[PDB]
Amino acid sequence: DLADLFPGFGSEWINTSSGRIFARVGGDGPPLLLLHGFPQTHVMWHRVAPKLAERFKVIVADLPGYGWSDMPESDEQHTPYTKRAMAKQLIEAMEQLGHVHFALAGHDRGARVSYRLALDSPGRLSKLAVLDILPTYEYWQRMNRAYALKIYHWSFLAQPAPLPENLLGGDPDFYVKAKLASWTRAGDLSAFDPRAVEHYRIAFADPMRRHVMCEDYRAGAYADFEHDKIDVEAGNKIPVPMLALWGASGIAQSAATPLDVWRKWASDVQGAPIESGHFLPEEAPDQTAEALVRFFS
Amino acid sequence: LADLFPGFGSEWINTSSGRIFARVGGDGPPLLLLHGFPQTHVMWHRVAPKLAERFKVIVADLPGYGWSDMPESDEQHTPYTKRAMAKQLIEAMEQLGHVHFALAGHDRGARVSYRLALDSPGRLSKLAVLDILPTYEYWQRMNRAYALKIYHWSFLAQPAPLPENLLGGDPDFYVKAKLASWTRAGDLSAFDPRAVEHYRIAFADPMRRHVMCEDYRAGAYADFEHDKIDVEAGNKIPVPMLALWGASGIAQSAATPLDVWRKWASDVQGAPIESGHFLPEEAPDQTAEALVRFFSA
Numbered sequence: 001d002l003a004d005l006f007p008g009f010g011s012e013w014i015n016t017s018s019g020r021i022f023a024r025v026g027g028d029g030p031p032l033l034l035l036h037g038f039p040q041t042h043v044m045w046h047r048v049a050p051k052l053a054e055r056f057k058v059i060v061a062d063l064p065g066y067g068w069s070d071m072p073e074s075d076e077q078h079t080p081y082t083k084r085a086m087a088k089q090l091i092e093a094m095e096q097l098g099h100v101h102f103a104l105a106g107h108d109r110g111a112r113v114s115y116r117l118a119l120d121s122p123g124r125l126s127k128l129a130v131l132d133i134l135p136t137y138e139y140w141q142r143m144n145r146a147y148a149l150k151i152y153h154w155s156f157l158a159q160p161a162p163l164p165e166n167l168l169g170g171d172p173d174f175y176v177k178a179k180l181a182s183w184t185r186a187g188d189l190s191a192f193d194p195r196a197v198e199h200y201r202i203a204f205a206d207p208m209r210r211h212v213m214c215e216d217y218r219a220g221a222y223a224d225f226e227h228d229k230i231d232v233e234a235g236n237k238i239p240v241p242m243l244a245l246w247g248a249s250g251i252a253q254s255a256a257t258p259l260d261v262w263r264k265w266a267s268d269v270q271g272a273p274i275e276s277g278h279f280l281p282e283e284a285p286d287q288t289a290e291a292l293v294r295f296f297s
Numbered sequence: 298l299a300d301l302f303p304g305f306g307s308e309w310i311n312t313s314s315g316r317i318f319a320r321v322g323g324d325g326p327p328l329l330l331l332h333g334f335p336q337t338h339v340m341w342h343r344v345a346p347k348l349a350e351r352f353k354v355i356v357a358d359l360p361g362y363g364w365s366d367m368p369e370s371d372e373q374h375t376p377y378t379k380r381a382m383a384k385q386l387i388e389a390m391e392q393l394g395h396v397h398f399a400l401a402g403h404d405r406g407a408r409v410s411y412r413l414a415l416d417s418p419g420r421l422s423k424l425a426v427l428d429i430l431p432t433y434e435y436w437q438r439m440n441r442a443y444a445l446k447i448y449h450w451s452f453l454a455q456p457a458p459l460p461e462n463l464l465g466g467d468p469d470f471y472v473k474a475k476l477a478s479w480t481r482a483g484d485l486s487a488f489d490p491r492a493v494e495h496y497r498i499a500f501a502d503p504m505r506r507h508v509m510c511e512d513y514r515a516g517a518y519a520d521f522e523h524d525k526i527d528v529e530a531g532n533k534i535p536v537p538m539l540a541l542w543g544a545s546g547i548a549q550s551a552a553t554p555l556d557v558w559r560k561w562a563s564d565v566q567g568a569p570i571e572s573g574h575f576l577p578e579e580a581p582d583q584t585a586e587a588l589v590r591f592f593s594a
Binding site for chain 2: 140141143144145148149152154155156158159163166167168169170171174175178221225
């Protein structure tokens, strides 16, 4: 049914106190954890991970609740799907592999986990790359008509259950494909490997998975924002060297010039636009992989 | 479907953009009542009889809603802009010989109404708007909190067929969700079940759903643009106007409603009513009294 898009990568079920993290593991060298985002799974890295795996031990993990990772029971505060909790869970996952100090690149929701990880537990990270995000606080702070329309899903998926769940159930295949297409530069699915789209489609076809994603966005509207707010107000800066990459046609470039933004959040950040929409590792895999190898090595 | 306007006639009013359905009852000065989303003219069924004691009450389905015809939309959502709807309702009233009339609108209908009053103030003797602020003001107040409260403004404005496709899986759920969510009580108890059935049946038609999305698309784009021009040009509604809003309704979450309306209207009085959004159904007596009082001098 589902293609193995990481030939030569192992498949690891990593136990944590909140459930298993699924990961493809390949390469040797310094550990590098890659976190996908919405509405994707770890397979979104399938075009860049082998290039990284030439120099790193590449752990391509499904976020908690996403893909084949277990889905911790949520609660009224969406706690396990807050980026703080996912970061803690991924730290615990990496510790199971003996990686207490690792490189981390995240895209989309995974990048939100990543920078929250960097804020909460900066000692865990050698270097951080975030792909096509600004901090969640910044999206919400920038919230206006234009951004509301553009990232409407931030407020739609954060509606109380079961409203988005029921609506997403109305046409899940359409919805996941629409998100994938609409955030690319092409506007269609041609930038993706069909076998990868199949992964995303099958994950999205599971109502429980969709519920988790809504939990993630609910956390994104509530606790994640509050956690970020604390850092902005404390002036807490990420001290880990970081790379901010963004799609010239991506989500982050609209709200505010991402490097300028991330510079408010990180003491040591470099940035570059990648000629792509949101899905940098799939729309622009060579460019993305090059940037990441250059930065991480 | 129940007749909720005993003794009211039924008019199909031809206009250049399609027929307007209306119930017509009473005698006296003409008073046009316009409903909003996701409702039809029947939302007035608790207040129209009281109004019909004093006015010729025309209870119209908005263009595209209820039993009114649905003009085909276009890429700018033109027929569902409030400007176009207002012109179409002016034409409808002219068909009845009403070239100068009182107007009370709720929700989208209220947006038609204030746009009517900006565009064609000579058509109105007095204007009442229920539980809205101008579209511009909602968008201008679109921060995190408000983006979450009226997420549907940005969700339903997403390009077709995204909201249509999600709404089609279980239309009943969404219409009942919206009816319930915007009431004070948070359920359907405020509504006459016969009225709910009207709303549900209207919502069950995919074309009607599409029109509603077109309305919201217009609300995100052209309506906003039209408003923006007026507010930036300092154009104010010169028609004496009543702004009623629900203490627990939508308008008051964005801002203090009379303060906002005083920026849009030279002659505005306002009162809150203990109600959620659906003033004529949640608080019919209070609504009906406020409207009778206002339109009666």
